[PDB]
Amino acid sequence: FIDKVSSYLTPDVDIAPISQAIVFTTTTHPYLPRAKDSHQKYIIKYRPPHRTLNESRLLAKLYLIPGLCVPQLIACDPYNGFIWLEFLGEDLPGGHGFSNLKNFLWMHDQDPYSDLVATTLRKVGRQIGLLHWNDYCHGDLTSSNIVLVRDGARWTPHLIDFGLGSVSNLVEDKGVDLYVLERAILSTHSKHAEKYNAWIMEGFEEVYREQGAKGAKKLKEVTKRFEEVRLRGRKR
Amino acid sequence: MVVSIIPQFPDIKVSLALFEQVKNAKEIRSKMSELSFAFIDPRLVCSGEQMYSAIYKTLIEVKYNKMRTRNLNSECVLCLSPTSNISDAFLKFGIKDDSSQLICLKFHTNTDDVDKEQLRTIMTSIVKGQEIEFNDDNLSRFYDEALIRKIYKLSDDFKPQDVNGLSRALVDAIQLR
């Protein structure tokens, strides 16, 4: 396991497991000469051999879409099930943990009514809106799969983990994505969970409303389906 | 000139050199049978990241899938391209009769050190031109974004602010072979 990976990579590549398929970090770039790269670390995702192929293809497609923030696809070995990705995020100060949306929300949960929090969550909604506007679905849109990248005093939301992603123009899939995130945010039982989701939805809507009349109609469709999904999501 | 290794393939060295004011591209092409190097058109290469990503794909392909071409040198020209068609890769990514710059690439599979002095002598015996450092500063002089967009089929909506942005899209195409 760790054996097969280390043998495949050889002792020249340092690895540290972070999640277990299995995810590692490494400080070694898979092909640029040492010291000719420009990032402290990278991600390696190993899946014994079609999520590997699926995630690689989608990361590449999404990068080309203006405004969409996803990790760089650095290297792909589809024969052995390895992909190397840009490492996004960092450790929040005060030991609040890795800067995914979940930990960020928890960190600010006692005092969330700030420009930072609302603005950041609207940016989260904008990423999802761009995704859906362009007819893509994430497939596992939890608060753990949204990673905040520091930009001075601001945060730049990125989407990660597209193993279950897909191309889809179906409002049903768009509604389910939104519902999955809505429920993940609510599951913390925070008093402010509803507000958080409302800020996210504001950014989502702004994306569609920037698209004139066609965007407004597409928005109504998605928001209608999304309300239906909420209804069908609870016991009746 | 630079000699490099891919981490997971410590025993395979690759030499890369860049030439400008090249005068005998037509001659090089006509003798490309007689000579082993790959002679690559720098108009399609915007960065080291791009080139090394193709070298990585080449080694992965040969080791774990299938080699399509004669040797590693030609396989890398194929892997630079977004296409499966070998002839089209050789044509688009190989030097042209009118090339005034070129990248000279060579895989060295033997253990034992690359004889750099001998390599530089061989290359200058082949290429009538002026070697400059293989680095991103020099590669940024000679790539043709318009041609790259056409060859890698990039949409006009894709508007990278810098070479890093463009390079990222090309590495994607390369890795998704």
From Swiss-Prot, chain A:
<keyword id="KW-0723">Serine/threonine-protein kinase</keyword>
<dbReference type="GO" id="GO:0000282">
    <property type="term" value="P:cellular bud site selection"/>
</dbReference>
<keyword id="KW-0779">Telomere</keyword>
<dbReference type="GO" id="GO:0016887">
    <property type="term" value="F:ATP hydrolysis activity"/>
</dbReference>
<keyword id="KW-0808">Transferase</keyword>
<dbReference type="GO" id="GO:0106310">
    <property type="term" value="F:protein serine kinase activity"/>
</dbReference>
<keyword id="KW-0597">Phosphoprotein</keyword>
<dbReference type="GO" id="GO:0004674">
    <property type="term" value="F:protein serine/threonine kinase activity"/>
</dbReference>
<comment type="subunit">
    <text>Component of the EKC/KEOPS complex composed of at least BUD32, CGI121, GON7, KAE1 and PCC1; the whole complex dimerizes.</text>
</comment>
<keyword id="KW-0819">tRNA processing</keyword>
<protein>
    <recommendedName>
        <fullName>EKC/KEOPS complex subunit BUD32</fullName>
        <ecNumber>3.6.-.-</ecNumber>
        <ecNumber>2.7.11.1</ecNumber>
    </recommendedName>
</protein>
<feature type="binding site">
    <location>
        <begin position="18"/>
        <end position="23"/>
    </location>
    <ligand>
        <name>ATP</name>
    </ligand>
</feature>
<feature type="modified residue" description="Phosphoserine; by autocatalysis">
    <location>
        <position position="168"/>
    </location>
</feature>
<dbReference type="InterPro" id="IPR022495">
    <property type="entry name" value="Bud32"/>
</dbReference>
<dbReference type="GO" id="GO:0005829">
    <property type="term" value="C:cytosol"/>
</dbReference>
<dbReference type="GO" id="GO:0002949">
    <property type="term" value="P:tRNA threonylcarbamoyladenosine modification"/>
</dbReference>
<dbReference type="GO" id="GO:0000722">
    <property type="term" value="P:telomere maintenance via recombination"/>
</dbReference>
<feature type="active site" description="Proton acceptor">
    <location>
        <position position="140"/>
    </location>
</feature>
<keyword id="KW-0547">Nucleotide-binding</keyword>
<feature type="domain" description="Protein kinase">
    <location>
        <begin position="12"/>
        <end position="236"/>
    </location>
</feature>
<dbReference type="GO" id="GO:0005634">
    <property type="term" value="C:nucleus"/>
</dbReference>
<dbReference type="InterPro" id="IPR011009">
    <property type="entry name" value="Kinase-like_dom_sf"/>
</dbReference>
UniProtKB/Swiss-Prot annotation, chain B:
<dbReference type="InterPro" id="IPR036504">
    <property type="entry name" value="CGI121/TPRKB_sf"/>
</dbReference>
<comment type="similarity">
    <text>Belongs to the CGI121/TPRKB family.</text>
</comment>
<keyword id="KW-0779">Telomere</keyword>
<dbReference type="GO" id="GO:0000781">
    <property type="term" value="C:chromosome, telomeric region"/>
</dbReference>
<dbReference type="GO" id="GO:0000408">
    <property type="term" value="C:EKC/KEOPS complex"/>
</dbReference>
<dbReference type="Pfam" id="PF08617">
    <property type="entry name" value="CGI-121"/>
</dbReference>
<dbReference type="GO" id="GO:0002949">
    <property type="term" value="P:tRNA threonylcarbamoyladenosine modification"/>
</dbReference>
<dbReference type="GO" id="GO:0005634">
    <property type="term" value="C:nucleus"/>
</dbReference>
<comment type="subunit">
    <text>Component of the EKC/KEOPS complex composed of at least BUD32, CGI121, GON7, KAE1 and PCC1; the whole complex dimerizes.</text>
</comment>
<dbReference type="GO" id="GO:1990145">
    <property type="term" value="P:maintenance of translational fidelity"/>
</dbReference>
<keyword id="KW-0819">tRNA processing</keyword>
<dbReference type="GO" id="GO:0000049">
    <property type="term" value="F:tRNA binding"/>
</dbReference>
<keyword id="KW-0805">Transcription regulation</keyword>
<keyword id="KW-0539">Nucleus</keyword>
<dbReference type="GO" id="GO:0006310">
    <property type="term" value="P:DNA recombination"/>
</dbReference>
<dbReference type="GO" id="GO:0005829">
    <property type="term" value="C:cytosol"/>
</dbReference>
<protein>
    <recommendedName>
        <fullName>EKC/KEOPS complex subunit CGI121</fullName>
    </recommendedName>
</protein>
<dbReference type="GO" id="GO:0045944">
    <property type="term" value="P:positive regulation of transcription by RNA polymerase II"/>
</dbReference>
<keyword id="KW-0158">Chromosome</keyword>
<keyword id="KW-0804">Transcription</keyword>
<keyword id="KW-0010">Activator</keyword>
<dbReference type="InterPro" id="IPR013926">
    <property type="entry name" value="CGI121/TPRKB"/>
</dbReference>
